């Protein structure tokens, strides 16, 4: 006997033992971890997210097993990419939680099994009495990593051999990852320090991977390059840094 309430209890606790039988049960009953009855009616959280939120010393051994079972029984991409909503975001995915939980190990795993690397997490039109569980970060995992000051993950997302994230990708606002970086720059020392690093890290990177395309030149939907956007929004620290570079380049 398996179903939502049970299966979710089981991964919530991280018990591999309490999975024995899931594979046979699924097959013999013609059922799949992608099916609607294994999705939270409200959100869309498959058991994947559910196990990803209940890590412990940052691991949860149901994960590998679950991925495997979903591979054997059904469409594994469909599984990994299945999207969920909370009050603050819609279109969130396993990959997203992996990054917000600052967990190199499972990002690698998901990316390796076929995670959509360009999944956009979009904001919801919320209240006042709900405000503060949202922040705009680009919409994509790459932007997410960049913004939350996670170099080692940005590298992996761009340098892995399974699926590389396009640096030139623009979100729903037309914003690439540099725009994102602009968006989150406040003017604090600690902030400006990591942000410029991140910017420089990515621009230079995009130079080698694509030499005759300019990243800095991609205009968002308001028609702005990042630098323009920094000027237009009082992001002095980064605006300054950006200039100092363009020039210093001979």
UniProtKB/Swiss-Prot annotation:
<comment type="subunit">
    <text>Homotetramer. Self-associates in an isoform-specific manner. Isoform 1 and isoform 5 can oligomerize, but isoform 2, isoform 4 and isoform 6 cannot oligomerize. Interacts with calmodulin. Interacts with Map7 and Src family Tyr protein kinases LYN, SRC, FYN, HCK, LCK and YES. Interacts with CTNNB1. The TRPV4 and CTNNB1 complex can interact with CDH1. Interacts with PACSIN1, PACSIN2 and PACSIN3 (via SH3 domain). Part of a complex containing MLC1, AQP4, HEPACAM and ATP1B1. Interacts with ITPR3.</text>
</comment>
<comment type="function">
    <text>(Microbial infection) Facilitates hepatitis C virus (HCV) replication, possibly through its action on DDX3X.</text>
</comment>
<feature type="binding site">
    <location>
        <position position="50"/>
    </location>
    <ligand>
        <name>ATP</name>
    </ligand>
</feature>
<comment type="similarity">
    <text>Belongs to the transient receptor (TC 1.A.4) family. TrpV subfamily. TRPV4 sub-subfamily.</text>
</comment>
<protein>
    <recommendedName>
        <fullName>Transient receptor potential cation channel subfamily V member 4</fullName>
    </recommendedName>
</protein>
<feature type="binding site">
    <location>
        <position position="45"/>
    </location>
    <ligand>
        <name>ATP</name>
    </ligand>
</feature>
<feature type="binding site">
    <location>
        <position position="54"/>
    </location>
    <ligand>
        <name>ATP</name>
    </ligand>
</feature>
<feature type="binding site">
    <location>
        <position position="197"/>
    </location>
    <ligand>
        <name>a 1,2-diacyl-sn-glycero-3-phospho-(1D-myo-inositol-4,5-bisphosphate)</name>
    </ligand>
</feature>
<feature type="repeat" description="ANK 3">
    <location>
        <begin position="222"/>
        <end position="250"/>
    </location>
</feature>
<feature type="binding site">
    <location>
        <begin position="89"/>
        <end position="92"/>
    </location>
    <ligand>
        <name>ATP</name>
    </ligand>
</feature>
<feature type="binding site">
    <location>
        <begin position="149"/>
        <end position="152"/>
    </location>
    <ligand>
        <name>a 1,2-diacyl-sn-glycero-3-phospho-(1D-myo-inositol-4,5-bisphosphate)</name>
    </ligand>
</feature>
<feature type="binding site">
    <location>
        <begin position="102"/>
        <end position="104"/>
    </location>
    <ligand>
        <name>a 1,2-diacyl-sn-glycero-3-phospho-(1D-myo-inositol-4,5-bisphosphate)</name>
    </ligand>
</feature>
<comment type="function">
    <text>Non-selective calcium permeant cation channel involved in osmotic sensitivity and mechanosensitivity. Activation by exposure to hypotonicity within the physiological range exhibits an outward rectification. Also activated by heat, low pH, citrate and phorbol esters. Increase of intracellular Ca(2+) potentiates currents. Channel activity seems to be regulated by a calmodulin-dependent mechanism with a negative feedback mechanism. Promotes cell-cell junction formation in skin keratinocytes and plays an important role in the formation and/or maintenance of functional intercellular barriers.</text>
</comment>
<feature type="modified residue" description="Phosphotyrosine">
    <location>
        <position position="106"/>
    </location>
</feature>
<feature type="binding site">
    <location>
        <position position="101"/>
    </location>
    <ligand>
        <name>ATP</name>
    </ligand>
</feature>
<feature type="repeat" description="ANK 2">
    <location>
        <begin position="137"/>
        <end position="166"/>
    </location>
</feature>
<feature type="repeat" description="ANK 1">
    <location>
        <begin position="90"/>
        <end position="119"/>
    </location>
</feature>
């Amino acid at each position: 006997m398996f179903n939502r309430p049970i299966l979710f209890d089981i991964v919530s606790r991280g018990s591999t033992a309490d999975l024995d039988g899931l594979l046979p049960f699924l097959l013999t009953h013609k059922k799949r971890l992608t099916d609607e009855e294994f999705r939270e009616p409200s959100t869309g959280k498959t058991c994947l997210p559910k196990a990803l939120l209940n890590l412990s010393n940052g691991r949860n051994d149901t994960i590998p097993v679950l991925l495997d079972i979903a591979e054997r029984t059904g469409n594994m991409r469909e599984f990994i990419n299945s999207p969920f909503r909370d009050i603050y975001y819609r279109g969130q995915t396993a990959l997203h939680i992996a990054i917000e939980r600052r967990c190199k190990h499972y990002v690698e795993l998901l990316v390796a099994q076929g995670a959509d690397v360009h999944a956009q997490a979009r904001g919801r039109f919320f209240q006042p009495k709900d405000e503060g569980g949202y922040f705009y970060f680009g919409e994509l995992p790459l932007s997410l990593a960049a913004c939350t000051n996670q170099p080692h993950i940005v590298n992996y997302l761009t340098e892995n051999p399974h699926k590389k994230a396009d640096m030139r990708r623009q979100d729903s606002r037309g914003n690439t990852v540099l725009h994102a970086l602009v968006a989150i720059a406040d003017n604090t020392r600690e902030n400006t320090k990591f942000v410029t690093k991140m910017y420089d890290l990515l621009l230079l990177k995009c130079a080698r991977l694509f030499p005759d395309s300019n990243l800095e030149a991609v205009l968002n939907n308001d028609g702005l390059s990042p630098l323009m956007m920094a000027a237009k929004t009082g992001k002095i620290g980064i605006f300054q840094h950006i200039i100092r570079r363009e020039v210093t380049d001979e």
